[PDB]
Design a protein around this ligand. Structure first.
Ligand SMILES: CC/C(=C(\c1ccc(O)cc1)c1ccc(OCCN(C)C)cc1)c1ccccc1
Ligand SMILES: CC/C(=C(\c1ccc(O)cc1)c1ccc(OCCN(C)C)cc1)c1ccccc1
Lengths: 210, 208
């Protein structure tokens, strides 16, 4: 119906970012990896631009604004893809010009991993996830990254609170069929965190192995 | 008073002890062994405790085990975490085994324990109650996100039931915060992460 925060967040939303493949080089695990690497690099600058638009976010200390972006960037990237693929089935809308099926992923050796995000994508799909929910869960994810390098903990909390409140409230007017929808959304965050940490690790392994 | 929560409480297992076998002088191995032996004896208990969770038993033995399979670490972690609330910078795994910053460094569990302590840091901040504990334990169990389940609906129903119990509990004894249940739900990620880091670390011993 109308929530201050949710609307703000829809607006603060970033524009369509396209992967931009290299047509002259062959499709290998090094290509796909390289393709995603930069795709994320670009998004990371995109996200830092965005976070400033997160109501109450710019007010925290800089050292703390960095602490969170430091921790929650991967979940943000991830929830991102997870969203792009809701209207699709069994594949990943990493980029609107970059989609991967079971076979493109088998070639990239990201089967295990992608079969993980397919799962995450399944839940949200079975909940009929809404754009307004994405943006909110996304902001929450950030204000809930639990960095250990926090200096002013009472502030992080008020930021968490402000965003949590917007969720309960938006879910309150748009879905009275489910007096427990917000909290349900919230329970999908762990998997988000699980996937992201899985992602981070595969990366530290590819870097170890080469 | 909420029925489901009264149950979970009553179900709450009896105290367990690590019993730092009067055998080997303190050392990485001794330490790691003590925990290995306690976790196992706890795991058994957990299995039994599980039978009481409302609606848990009705599940096919296949699912029941798929959940336990995935959540047993969060459960173990949550325990020591609740056990450690009333303390400072120390992790209580058992009344006979209490790890302080140094004993940790000795076991190499500095990083692991240090994240676990972070978990406690938050629960202490919001004065976690035994009631809230027993309930999250059950919730974490059914919200374990296992990839290989048969009956998705029945499981979902179990998460709703327990979720209802939590939102309800907060609604009665904690009217001062309408977002409390949700905030408890928000501590689940960390628990997940920590339980994960904890597990990958165990397997990482002599492998690649
Ligand atoms: C899951 C795909 C992915 C990345 C990704 C995820 C979501 C998204 O929207 C875009 C990309 C990925 C790849 C590279 C990367 O690099 C960050 C480091 N920069 C500074 C070089 C981050 C994420 C990746 C992670 C680990 C190993 C290999 C690939
Ligand atoms: C966090 C301490 C811990 C365990 C633990 C946690 C909570 C608790 O109440 C009791 C113990 C731990 C240690 C061993 C273990 O083994 C399970 C596998 N069995 C079948 C051999 C599980 C957890 C541990 C985890 C990873 C590496 C080293 C130690």
């Amino acid at each position: 119906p109308y929530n201050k925060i949710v609307s703000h967040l829809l607006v603060a939303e970033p524009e369509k970012i396209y992967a931009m493949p290299d047509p002259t080089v062959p499709d290998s695990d090094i290509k796909a990896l390289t393709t995603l690497c930069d795709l994320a690099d670009r998004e990371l600058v995109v996200i830092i631009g965005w976070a400033k638009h997160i109501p109450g976010f710019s007010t925290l200390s800089l050292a703390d604004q960095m602490s969170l972006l430091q921790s929650a960037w991967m979940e943000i990237l991830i929830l991102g893809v997870v969203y792009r693929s809701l209207s699709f089935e069994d594949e990943l809308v990493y980029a609107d010009d970059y989609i991967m099926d079971e076979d493109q992923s088998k070639l990239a050796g990201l089967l295990d991993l992608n079969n993980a995000i397919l799962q995450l994508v399944k839940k949200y799909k079975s909940m009929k996830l809404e754009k307004e929910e994405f943006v909110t869960l996304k902001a929450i994810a950030l204000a809930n990254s639990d960095s250990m390098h926090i200096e002013d903990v009472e502030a992080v909390q008020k930021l968490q609170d402000v965003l949590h409140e917007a969720l309960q409230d938006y879910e309150a007017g748009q879905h009275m069929e489910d007096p427990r929808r917000a909290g349900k959304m919230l329970m999908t965050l762990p998997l988000l965190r699980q996937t992201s940490t899985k992602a981070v690790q595969h990366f530290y392994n590819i870097k170890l192995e080469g």
